[PDB]
Design a protein around this nucleic acid. Structure first.
Ligand SMILES: Cc1cn([C@H]2C[C@H](O)[C@@H](COP(=O)(O)NP(=O)(O)OP(=O)(O)O)O2)c(=O)[nH]c1=O
Ligand SMILES: [Mg+2]
Ligand SMILES: [Mg+2]
Length: 430
DNA sequence: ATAATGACGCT
DNA sequence: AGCGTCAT
């Protein structure tokens, strides 16, 4: 009762760029704007595998992982841009640099956690505090929230999207407890005002559109972000959670998209996140373990405590290439030459990293996959990273895997290698 | 025959 | 240390 802790302590946003790789290519090539288009890599195999799809092309059913030859059958006017290739592999530099543009702008507003190349969580608790003080006690106008959705509103006794959005925003703002700087709903509202400002800044200064979720934790902010894509932001209040989760499939919640989520569904005999509330914490801990049990108990009530970590820089820098099917590497010099390609890209990226960020990696991780073997990595081995020298790194990486070579013949490699992966890790102040 | 990456848990 | 899960 007077002591129940309701997970309303923070204001957290998740900002995610809309069809990001497509937007980067579309800013550079105006002929691609506002058309169905996709970004692909490796043109030689069925037109390339699609890794990003504009919303106009999604309306025809084009999805990521589709072959471009197959996507053209769904969308004959689909326009393509292809990832740069360097040293015989995909080169994502252009998108990393675009990502840096966005991240630096978000960093001006608050502490951000870089979560992927195109999204970052934002901890707005302090910033909300400040703006509440600066704003006398004056109402929050709907004009401050021109792209915001209030999830679950409108309710109670218009046929177009923007009309619904406004009605719900009006209902929310009409109900707001403005003379109450402690109310979690007021805090989220002010957080949403700031995220409008952050997204306007991103669009003005980069040309890129994005969406955002605003809620009290990372999981809800990420869920909310996807509710009204593209180019829109969604506020998910604590109060919206029971109805939102009542028909929310379990797999849609961050970290439940895989085997854990599948076992939650099968073991408990449930479909929706809200049905989790019927189980005691001990019961959930008995099926899924102490931390997963506790996490599920709180999460299905809308409560989650994972912090927004102050980290804008990756912890690792890695290069990898697949060699599927008959292209699997089978001679030792083939293995050596690719390791050298990977090491040369890694040297470039590390040197830049050291200049910009004043740190050095100190460990090199070599990972390979074998023909027939099932998993992402078949095998990982590590060694010291003492010099950003591509030839040393590729030689060292070879040294530590070369006795994986089951092959008798002096010049062959068996089993064939279907993946090579070099990763620099364990950064330290430089 | 998606691919290329990245964060982190378990042991 | 080396492996497994989950994600974009
Ligand atoms: C999912 C996914 C995305 N990406 C690259 C390009 C995507 O544009 C960049 C950002 O990912 P996202 O936010 O999951 N997808 P999106 O930005 O293209 O589209 P949306 O507007 O966010 O739904 O992901 C991959 O390279 N492999 C992937 O598996
Ligand atoms: Mg995105
Ligand atoms: Mg994303």
């Amino acid at each position: 009762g007077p002591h129940m802790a309701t997970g309303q302590d923070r204001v957290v946003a998740l900002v995610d760029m809309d069809c990001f790789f497509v937007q980067v290519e579309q800013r550079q090539n105006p002929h691609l704007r506002n058309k169905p288009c996709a970004v692909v890599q490796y043109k030689s195999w069925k037109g390339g595998g699609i890794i990003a799809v504009s919303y106009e092309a999604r309306a025809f059913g084009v999805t990521r992982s589709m072959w471009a030859d197959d996507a053209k059958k769904l969308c004959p006017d689909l326009l393509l841009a292809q990832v740069r290739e360097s040293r015989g592999k995909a080169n994502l530099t252009k998108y990393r640099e675009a990502s840096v543009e966005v991240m630096e702008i978000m960093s001006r507003f608050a502490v951000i956690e870089r979560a992927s190349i195109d999204e970052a969580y934002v901890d707005l608790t302090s910033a909300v505090q400040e703006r509440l003080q600066k704003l006398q006690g004056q109402p929050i106008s709907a004009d401050l929230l021109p792209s915001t959705y209030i999830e679950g509103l409108p309710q109670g006794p218009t046929v177009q999207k923007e009309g619904m959005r406004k009605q719900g925003l009006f209902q929310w703002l009409d109900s707001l407890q403005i003379d109450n700087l402690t109310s979690p709903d007021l805090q989220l509202t002010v957080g949403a005002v700031i995220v409008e400002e952050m997204r306007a800044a991103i669009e003005r200064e980069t040309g890129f559109q994005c969406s955002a979720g605003i809620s009290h934790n990372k999981v809800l902010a990420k869920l909310a972000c996807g509710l009204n894509k593209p180019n829109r932001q969604t506020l998910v209040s604590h109060g919206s959670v029971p109805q939102l989760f009542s028909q929310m499939p379990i797999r849609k919640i961050r970290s439940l998209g895989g085997k854990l989520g599948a076992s939650v569904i099968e073991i408990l005999g449930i479909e929706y996140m809200g049905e989790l509330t019927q189980f005691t914490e001990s019961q959930l801990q008995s099926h899924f373990g102490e931390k997963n049990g506790s996490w599920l108990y709180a999460m299905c009530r809308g409560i989650e405590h994972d912090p927004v970590k102050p980290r804008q820089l990756p912890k690792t820098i890695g290069c990898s290439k697949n060699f599927p099917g008959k292209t699997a590497l089978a001679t030792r010099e083939q293995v050596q030459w690719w390791l050298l390609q990977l090491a040369q890209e890694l040297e470039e990226r590390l040197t830049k990293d050291r200049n910009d960020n004043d740190r050095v990696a100190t460990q090199l991780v070599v990972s390979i996959r074998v023909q027939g073997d099932k998993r992402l990595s078949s095998l990982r081995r590590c060694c010291a990273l003492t010099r950003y020298d591509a030839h040393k790194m590729s030689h060292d990486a070879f040294t530590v895997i070369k006795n994986c070579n089951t092959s008798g013949i002096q010049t062959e490699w068996s089993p064939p290698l279907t993946m090579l992966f070099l990763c620099a890790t364990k950064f330290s102040a430089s």
